């Protein structure tokens, strides 16, 4: 009658409860499904125990190692970037930066060591955009530039991305200048903000520098190279000829 005396869950939601050792006609009495007087009835068997036979992890050993230094990149495909621009969830008229990529829901809700653009759906991508990520595939770079757009790969960290979304750091696709001829214009730009902003870090390791220093990745340090210089900090392009 009363609504509160008529509520229930769906019948399929309810499952039988098994109370063991409560009589013979229950089907689980006097042994509770254990058997007759074995180790499995008196006590407990270790889970890693196989009776004494050596496990395969010992007879064969553990293979390989786990890379604790590899960066965890958020993978973004052109197939998905196009689906967002058409739906109106990403503005193609403005620069597409990690802040706009994270706040769009296109890579999810988890921030990781970086964002990499991949080339799934490169045949149907024909929207001119100005995107900036940490890495990009050789297929995505051509698809973005073939449609009349621009792409730049910049160095980021898991902490830098958080500050970008939080608004504590302003985005910039250029490295910090070096020299006494830029200290003034850079200090003035900071005073004009009237708010404490954290700088975006630049690469420090050999690999990270070489990555953003070559034009194949459209790295934001590639402008520091000469037309004949190599991105590597150690290797050089040898010379051809008879000498």
């Amino acid at each position: 009658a009363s609504i509160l005396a008529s509520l229930s869950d769906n019948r399929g939601a309810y499952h039988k409860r098994i109370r063991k050792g409560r009589g013979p006609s229950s089907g689980y009495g006097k042994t509770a499904g254990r058997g007759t007087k074995g180790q499995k009835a008196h006590g407990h068997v270790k889970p890693w125990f196989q009776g004494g036979q050596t496990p395969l992890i010992v007879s064969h050993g553990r293979k390989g190692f786990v890379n604790q230094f590899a960066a965890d990149m958020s993978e973004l495909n052109l197939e998905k970037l196009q689906e967002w621009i058409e739906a109106g969830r990403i503005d193609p008229t403005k620069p597409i930066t990690p802040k706009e990529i994270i706040k769009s829901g296109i890579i999810g809700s988890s921030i990781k060591d970086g964002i990499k653009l991949l080339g799934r759906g490169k045949e149907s991508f024909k929207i001119p955009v100005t995107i900036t990520v940490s890495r990009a595939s050789a297929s995505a770079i051509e698809a973005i530039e073939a449609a009349g757009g621009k792409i730049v790969t910049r160095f980021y960290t898991k902490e830098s991305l958080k500050r970008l979304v939080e608004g504590k750091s302003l985005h910039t696709d250029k490295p910090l200048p070096v020299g006494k001829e830029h200290v003034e214009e850079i200090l003035a730009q900071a005073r004009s903000l009237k708010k404490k902003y954290y700088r975006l870090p630049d690469p420090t390791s050999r690999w990270d520098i070489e990555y953003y220093r070559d034009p194949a990745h459209r790295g934001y340090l590639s402008h520091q190279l000469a037309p004949g210089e190599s991105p590597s900090l150690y290797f050089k392009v040898p010379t051809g000829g008879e000498k």
Binding site: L176, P177, V178, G179, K180, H182, V183, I186, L187, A190, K196, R199, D202, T204
Partner: protein, 54 residues
């Protein structure tokens, strides 16, 4: 500061941790330019990076 009578350096009256707290507290109130020289000042940290670099 090096004590004149005893040739021993005296630790600064404010540790590098307490120096950064004043700079942070003085920056949130607009009196950072009233503090003496400090390697924790936001302009000095930035100037040393732009001038010299990595």
């Amino acid at each position: 500061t090096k004590h004149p009578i005893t040739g021993k350096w005296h630790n600064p009256k404010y540790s590098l941790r307490r120096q950064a707290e004043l700079v942070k507290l003085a920056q949130e109130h607009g009196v950072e330019e009233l503090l003496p020289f400090t390697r924790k000042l936001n302009e000095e940290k930035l100037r040393k990076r732009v001038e010299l670099g990595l």
